[PDB]
Scaffold this active site. Structure first.
Site, PDB file in Angstrom:
ATOM      1  N   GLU A   1      31.007  -3.300  16.623  1.00  0.00           N
ATOM      2  CA  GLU A   1      30.113  -2.179  16.355  1.00  0.00           C
ATOM      3  C   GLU A   1      30.708  -1.255  15.299  1.00  0.00           C
ATOM      4  O   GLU A   1      29.987  -0.737  14.439  1.00  0.00           O
ATOM      5  CB  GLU A   1      29.824  -1.415  17.646  1.00  0.00           C
ATOM      6  CG  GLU A   1      28.489  -0.685  17.649  1.00  0.00           C
ATOM      7  CD  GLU A   1      28.458   0.499  16.699  1.00  0.00           C
ATOM      8  OE1 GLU A   1      29.473   1.227  16.621  1.00  0.00           O
ATOM      9  OE2 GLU A   1      27.420   0.699  16.030  1.00  0.00           O
TER      10      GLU A   1
ATOM     11  N   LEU B   1      34.908   8.890  21.317  1.00  0.00           N
ATOM     12  CA  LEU B   1      33.710   8.197  21.755  1.00  0.00           C
ATOM     13  C   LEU B   1      33.710   8.054  23.277  1.00  0.00           C
ATOM     14  O   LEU B   1      34.769   7.895  23.890  1.00  0.00           O
ATOM     15  CB  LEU B   1      33.614   6.818  21.107  1.00  0.00           C
ATOM     16  CG  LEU B   1      33.464   6.761  19.580  1.00  0.00           C
ATOM     17  CD1 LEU B   1      32.889   5.415  19.170  1.00  0.00           C
ATOM     18  CD2 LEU B   1      32.598   7.891  19.031  1.00  0.00           C
TER      19      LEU B   1
HETATM   20  N1  LIG Z   1      28.661   7.916  18.618  1.00  0.00           N
HETATM   21  C1  LIG Z   1      28.542   8.329  17.339  1.00  0.00           C
HETATM   22  O1  LIG Z   1      27.898   7.705  16.518  1.00  0.00           O
HETATM   23  C2  LIG Z   1      29.206   9.574  16.892  1.00  0.00           C
HETATM   24  C3  LIG Z   1      29.087  10.015  15.570  1.00  0.00           C
HETATM   25  C4  LIG Z   1      29.724  11.184  15.193  1.00  0.00           C
HETATM   26  C5  LIG Z   1      30.457  11.894  16.128  1.00  0.00           C
HETATM   27  N2  LIG Z   1      30.564  11.467  17.370  1.00  0.00           N
HETATM   28  C6  LIG Z   1      31.334  12.245  18.345  1.00  0.00           C
HETATM   29  O2  LIG Z   1      30.704  13.508  18.456  1.00  0.00           O
HETATM   30  C7  LIG Z   1      31.701  14.551  18.596  1.00  0.00           C
HETATM   31  C8  LIG Z   1      31.625  15.474  17.396  1.00  0.00           C
HETATM   32  O3  LIG Z   1      30.285  15.913  17.203  1.00  0.00           O
HETATM   33  P1  LIG Z   1      29.928  17.464  17.440  1.00  0.00           P
HETATM   34  O4  LIG Z   1      28.396  17.629  17.345  1.00  0.00           O
HETATM   35  O5  LIG Z   1      30.681  17.953  18.696  1.00  0.00           O
HETATM   36  O6  LIG Z   1      30.604  18.159  16.159  1.00  0.00           O
HETATM   37  P2  LIG Z   1      30.254  18.092  14.599  1.00  0.00           P
HETATM   38  O7  LIG Z   1      28.760  18.418  14.422  1.00  0.00           O
HETATM   39  O8  LIG Z   1      30.844  16.803  14.003  1.00  0.00           O
HETATM   40  O9  LIG Z   1      31.099  19.329  14.047  1.00  0.00           O
HETATM   41  C9  LIG Z   1      30.767  20.656  14.445  1.00  0.00           C
HETATM   42  C10 LIG Z   1      31.366  21.629  13.452  1.00  0.00           C
HETATM   43  O10 LIG Z   1      31.075  21.162  12.110  1.00  0.00           O
HETATM   44  C11 LIG Z   1      30.705  22.254  11.293  1.00  0.00           C
HETATM   45  N3  LIG Z   1      29.289  22.129  10.964  1.00  0.00           N
HETATM   46  C12 LIG Z   1      28.358  21.367  11.611  1.00  0.00           C
HETATM   47  N4  LIG Z   1      27.154  21.440  11.091  1.00  0.00           N
HETATM   48  C13 LIG Z   1      27.313  22.309  10.026  1.00  0.00           C
HETATM   49  C14 LIG Z   1      26.411  22.804   9.065  1.00  0.00           C
HETATM   50  N5  LIG Z   1      25.117  22.476   9.031  1.00  0.00           N
HETATM   51  N6  LIG Z   1      26.888  23.656   8.140  1.00  0.00           N
HETATM   52  C15 LIG Z   1      28.181  23.989   8.168  1.00  0.00           C
HETATM   53  N7  LIG Z   1      29.130  23.592   9.016  1.00  0.00           N
HETATM   54  C16 LIG Z   1      28.622  22.744   9.931  1.00  0.00           C
HETATM   55  C17 LIG Z   1      31.076  23.507  12.071  1.00  0.00           C
HETATM   56  O11 LIG Z   1      32.458  23.801  11.866  1.00  0.00           O
HETATM   57  P3  LIG Z   1      32.931  25.320  11.724  1.00  0.00           P
HETATM   58  O12 LIG Z   1      33.085  25.917  13.104  1.00  0.00           O
HETATM   59  O13 LIG Z   1      34.254  25.365  10.998  1.00  0.00           O
HETATM   60  O14 LIG Z   1      31.893  26.099  10.951  1.00  0.00           O
HETATM   61  C18 LIG Z   1      30.815  23.044  13.499  1.00  0.00           C
HETATM   62  O15 LIG Z   1      31.500  23.825  14.468  1.00  0.00           O
HETATM   63  C19 LIG Z   1      33.025  13.818  18.763  1.00  0.00           C
HETATM   64  O16 LIG Z   1      33.288  13.586  20.143  1.00  0.00           O
HETATM   65  C20 LIG Z   1      32.791  12.523  17.988  1.00  0.00           C
HETATM   66  O17 LIG Z   1      33.654  11.488  18.458  1.00  0.00           O
HETATM   67  C21 LIG Z   1      29.958  10.337  17.781  1.00  0.00           C
HETATM   68  N1  LIG Z   2      27.029   3.143  14.589  1.00  0.00           N
HETATM   69  C1  LIG Z   2      28.011   4.036  14.594  1.00  0.00           C
HETATM   70  N2  LIG Z   2      29.087   3.722  15.343  1.00  0.00           N
HETATM   71  C2  LIG Z   2      30.182   4.520  15.463  1.00  0.00           C
HETATM   72  O1  LIG Z   2      31.144   4.189  16.161  1.00  0.00           O
HETATM   73  C3  LIG Z   2      30.092   5.765  14.702  1.00  0.00           C
HETATM   74  N3  LIG Z   2      31.152   6.608  14.778  1.00  0.00           N
HETATM   75  C4  LIG Z   2      31.045   7.722  14.084  1.00  0.00           C
HETATM   76  C5  LIG Z   2      32.157   8.713  14.107  1.00  0.00           C
HETATM   77  N4  LIG Z   2      33.422   8.208  14.591  1.00  0.00           N
HETATM   78  C6  LIG Z   2      34.219   7.345  13.894  1.00  0.00           C
HETATM   79  C7  LIG Z   2      35.530   7.047  14.342  1.00  0.00           C
HETATM   80  C8  LIG Z   2      36.334   6.175  13.637  1.00  0.00           C
HETATM   81  C9  LIG Z   2      35.881   5.555  12.457  1.00  0.00           C
HETATM   82  C10 LIG Z   2      36.782   4.626  11.727  1.00  0.00           C
HETATM   83  O2  LIG Z   2      37.973   4.476  12.025  1.00  0.00           O
HETATM   84  N5  LIG Z   2      36.207   3.941  10.684  1.00  0.00           N
HETATM   85  C11 LIG Z   2      36.908   2.994   9.830  1.00  0.00           C
HETATM   86  C12 LIG Z   2      37.387   1.780  10.628  1.00  0.00           C
HETATM   87  C13 LIG Z   2      36.277   1.003  11.318  1.00  0.00           C
HETATM   88  C14 LIG Z   2      36.804  -0.234  12.019  1.00  0.00           C
HETATM   89  O3  LIG Z   2      37.266  -1.162  11.321  1.00  0.00           O
HETATM   90  O4  LIG Z   2      36.753  -0.281  13.268  1.00  0.00           O
HETATM   91  C15 LIG Z   2      35.972   2.557   8.708  1.00  0.00           C
HETATM   92  O5  LIG Z   2      36.320   2.222   7.610  1.00  0.00           O
HETATM   93  O6  LIG Z   2      34.647   2.585   9.052  1.00  0.00           O
HETATM   94  C16 LIG Z   2      34.588   5.856  12.018  1.00  0.00           C
HETATM   95  C17 LIG Z   2      33.770   6.727  12.714  1.00  0.00           C
HETATM   96  C18 LIG Z   2      29.897   7.952  13.332  1.00  0.00           C
HETATM   97  N6  LIG Z   2      28.834   7.166  13.238  1.00  0.00           N
HETATM   98  C19 LIG Z   2      28.951   6.018  13.957  1.00  0.00           C
HETATM   99  N7  LIG Z   2      27.899   5.160  13.893  1.00  0.00           N
END
Ligand SMILES: NC(=O)c1ccc[n+]([C@@H]2O[C@H](COP(=O)([O-])OP(=O)(O)OC[C@H]3O[C@@H](n4cnc5c(N)ncnc54)[C@H](OP(=O)(O)O)[C@@H]3O)[C@@H](O)[C@H]2O)c1
Ligand SMILES: Nc1nc(=O)c2nc(CNc3ccc(C(=O)N[C@@H](CCC(=O)O)C(=O)O)cc3)cnc2[nH]1
Length: 184
Positions: free
Chosen positions: A28, A20
């Site tokens: 959160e 993140l």
């Molecule tokens: N702030 C938030 O709420 C939040 C939530 C989620 C994630 N994140 C962050 O976002 C980053 C990850 O997200 P990202 O967009 O870089 O990666 P991602 O979409 O989680 O993963 C990408 C990979 O997933 C597979 N994939 C994705 N969509 C697919 C589909 N429709 N069909 C089949 N395979 C699929 C593929 O793997 P293959 O190459 O093997 O095909 C692709 O290379 C991390 O830094 C994470 O911490 C943040």
């Molecule tokens: N609102 C929102 N906030 C996020 O931080 C978030 N993160 C992701 C992806 N990243 C992560 C990273 C860690 C955990 C995790 O450790 N989850 C555990 C522990 C949560 C806690 O107690 O802090 C779980 O059971 O949810 C979940 C999502 C996807 N959607 C989100 N959506």
């Protein structure tokens, strides 16, 4: 119903180097745990759909996300990652799977939990869609971003059950919980 959940910075960033962009916000993350884990139907579980990088962005000790059925998306992986319950080759294969009676009878809500391309395809999916968006009120260095929210289709709801709409603050950083909705 089909739900997305995400936390975004002001610059619409969600990740940086597989983590993140901001420090851990304990409350959160609790919100994420509560919304994704709590089923509104007795005896049923919730199911989370996530891309491969998001899955590995979760600390190994928390994998799989407890209390929820974890489904990973990948076109490359031969086997499902150790700890995952299902593997699918596309978003729609996964959704078609959640509708199988053997699952549907044990599953209530489906949650998209990232990443970017998974969010985009889901938000354009036709039907009833809700977006649970946490607005982090501060710019953060990010290499992954949340796709556009089309406000010609998505409506910000003024309230939602179990969601506090007041501004929150942790580690000095302010944020608020929002919920958007579209129908067809
Ligand atoms: N702030 C938030 O709420 C939040 C939530 C989620 C994630 N994140 C962050 O976002 C980053 C990850 O997200 P990202 O967009 O870089 O990666 P991602 O979409 O989680 O993963 C990408 C990979 O997933 C597979 N994939 C994705 N969509 C697919 C589909 N429709 N069909 C089949 N395979 C699929 C593929 O793997 P293959 O190459 O093997 O095909 C692709 O290379 C991390 O830094 C994470 O911490 C943040
Ligand atoms: N609102 C929102 N906030 C996020 O931080 C978030 N993160 C992701 C992806 N990243 C992560 C990273 C860690 C955990 C995790 O450790 N989850 C555990 C522990 C949560 C806690 O107690 O802090 C779980 O059971 O949810 C979940 C999502 C996807 N959607 C989100 N959506």
């Amino acid at each position: 119903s089909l739900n997305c959940i995400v936390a975004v910075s002001q610059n619409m960033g969600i990740g940086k180097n597989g983590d993140l962009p901001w420090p851990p916000l304990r409350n959160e993350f609790r919100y994420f745990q509560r919304m994704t884990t709590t089923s509104s139907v007795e005896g049923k579980q919730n199911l989370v759909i996530m891309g491969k990088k998001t899955w590995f962005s979760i600390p190994e000790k928390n994998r799989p996300l407890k209390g929820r059925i974890n489904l990973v998306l990948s076109r490359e992986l031969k086997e499902p990652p150790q700890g995952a319950h299902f593997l699918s080759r596309s978003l729609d294969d996964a959704l078609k799977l959640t509708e199988q009676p053997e699952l549907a009878n044990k599953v209530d809500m489906v949650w998209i939990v990232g990443g970017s391309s998974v969010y985009k395809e889901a938000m354009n999916h036709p039907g009833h869609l809700k977006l649970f968006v946490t607005r982090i009120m501060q710019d953060f260095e990010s290499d992954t971003f949340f796709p556009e929210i089309d406000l010609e289709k998505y409506k910000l709801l003024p309230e939602y059950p179990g969601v506090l709409s007041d501004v929150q603050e942790e580690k000095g950083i302010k944020y608020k919980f929002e919920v958007y909705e579209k129908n067809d």
